[PDB]
Amino acid sequence: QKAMITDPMDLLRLFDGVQDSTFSLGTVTEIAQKNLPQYNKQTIKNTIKEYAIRSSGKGDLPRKWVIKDAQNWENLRANAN
């Protein structure tokens, strides 16, 4: 049981800031915590490691993050009506 973000609206706010970010995990966390100050970095990190993945740029484009399950993401966008 590793602690994660579960509020959908919070997950959405996380995703819109992880998706396409080229920054390291560290920086990508720090930035997320600003937008989600209630959580502790480890939880954010845990959440990122869960839903996202850092590409390995074959040159282009550089290493960016993507949410692995575009489906699920769309459901969370739908739960927001």
Numbering used by the authors: 520 to 600
How did the manuscript describe this experimental structure?
Although this putative dimerization sequence is apparently not conserved in yeast, purified S. cerevisiae Cac1 elutes from size exclusion chromatography at a molecular weight consistent with a dimer, confirmed by multiangle light scattering. To gain structural insight into the putative Cac1 dimer, we crystallized E. coli-expressed Cac1457, a region that forms many stable intra-Cac1 chemical cross-links. The structure was determined using molecular replacement to a resolution of 2.9 Å with coordinates from a recently determined structure of Cac1C (522–600). Even though the entire 457–606 protein was present in the crystal, only amino acids 520–600 were visible in our electron density, and the 'wing' (576–581) was disordered. As expected, the structure we determined is virtually identical to the reported Cac1C winged helix (WH) domain, with an overall root mean squared deviation (r.m.s.d.) of 1.14 Å for all atoms. Indeed, we observed a crystallographic homo-dimer. The inset shows major interacting residues buried in half of the homodimer interface, which is arranged in a head-to-tail symmetry with identical interactions on both halves. The putative dimerization domain consists of residues 572–600 at the C-terminus, and does not appear to extend to amino acid 386, as Cac1386(Py) and Cac1454(Py) have similar dimerization constants. Therefore, Cac1 dimerization is not necessary to promote (H3/H4)2 tetramerization, consistent with the functional stoichiometry of CAF-1. Thus, the WH domain exhibits binding plasticity for different partners.
The H3/H4 chaperone CAF-1 is conserved among all eukaryotes and has important roles during DNA replication and repair, regulation of gene expression, and maintenance of chromatin accessibility. The budding yeast CAF-1 complex consists of subunits Cac1, Cac2, and Cac3, which differ in their ability to bind H3/H4. The data indicate that Cac1 is the major subunit required and is sufficient for binding and tetramerizing H3/H4. Rather, the Cac1 glutamate/aspartate (ED) domain is also required to tetramerize H3/H4 in vitro. These results support an architectural model for the replication-coupled CAF-1-H3/H4 complex, in which Cac1 scaffolds all protein-protein interactions and is predominantly involved in H3/H4 tetramerization.
